[PDB]
Design a protein around this ligand. Structure first.
Ligand SMILES: [Cl-]
Length: 253
């Protein structure tokens, strides 16, 4: 039976990645962030906490040739296929500078107020695929790879998505971003004004209901200043902005 609310952070609190918000910086690498975040979560959840790692966004962003255009956007299915076939090494944020390949780009504000420099509208070139761990990290790049066993799209059905998240952990999901999404501060988002800005990719970690209004609970990759401490909520059950139609995940076993 599906509970009225669920929060992956509360079910698997040993897994540090689940409550970590990242920042893609001045790069359209959301496709890679939603992927490595959910893969980090799932690697920990599905291994009973034996894997408790932060997977490298830059490794996937830079090295996956079949995933699209890097900092100019990408494709979800091939990102999970890459994790299954090639694997992804470890790597923290830029400021944390941990793991094999930490992210090269700094935190910035994504169309919102706060303490980081504004992202602005310029975007970085996709980083090179370096295949080399940072000097202090004493495991060779190929030996730091973490691989999945399977990947799949999740059925476009609310209950199927809920069952998948509750059993196997957070999922990656695409949705259509409209201009009013950039004005989001808090609450349960739905598209009301503005034109399309294309597709975004995020990580769905749970769901809930407030004042009878059902929502998905989602981690964005725009740092902790954006939205509700880095998270947002969006209407659930009505395929709002295609949120129930682009879900992808995978398993280590
Ligand atoms: Cl990161």
């Amino acid at each position: 039976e599906i509970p009225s609310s669920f929060d992956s952070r509360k079910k698997w609190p040993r897994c540090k990645s689940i409550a970590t918000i990242r920042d893609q910086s001045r790069c359209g690498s959301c496709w890679a962030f939603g992927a490595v975040e959910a893969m980090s979560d799932r690697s920990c959840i599905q291994s009973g906490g034996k894997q408790n790692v932060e997977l490298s966004a830059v490794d996937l962003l830079s090295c996956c040739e079949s995933c699209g255009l890097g900092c100019e956007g990408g494709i979800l299915g091939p990102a999970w296929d890459y994790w299954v076939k090639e694997g992804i090494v470890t790597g923290s944020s830029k400021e944390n500078h941990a793991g094999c390949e930490p992210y090269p780009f700094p935190k910035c504000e994504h169309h919102t107020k706060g303490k980081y420099p504004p992202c602005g509208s310029k975007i970085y070139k996709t980083p090179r695929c370096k295949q080399t761990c940072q000097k202090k990290y004493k495991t060779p790049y190929t030996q730091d790879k973490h691989r999945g066993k399977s990947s799949y799209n999740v059925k476009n059905d609310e209950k199927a998505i809920q069952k998948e998240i509750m059993k196997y952990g957070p999922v990656e999901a695409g949705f259509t971003v409209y201009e009013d999404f950039l004005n989001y501060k808090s609450g349960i988002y739905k598209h009301i004004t503005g034109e399309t800005l294309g597709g975004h990719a995020i990580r769905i970690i749970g769901w809930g209901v407030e004042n009878k209004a059902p929502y998905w609970l989602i981690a964005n990759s725009w740092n902790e200043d954006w939205g509700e401490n880095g998270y947002f909520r969006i209407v659930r059950g009505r395929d709002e902005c295609s949120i129930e139609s682009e879900v992808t995940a995978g398993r280590i076993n």
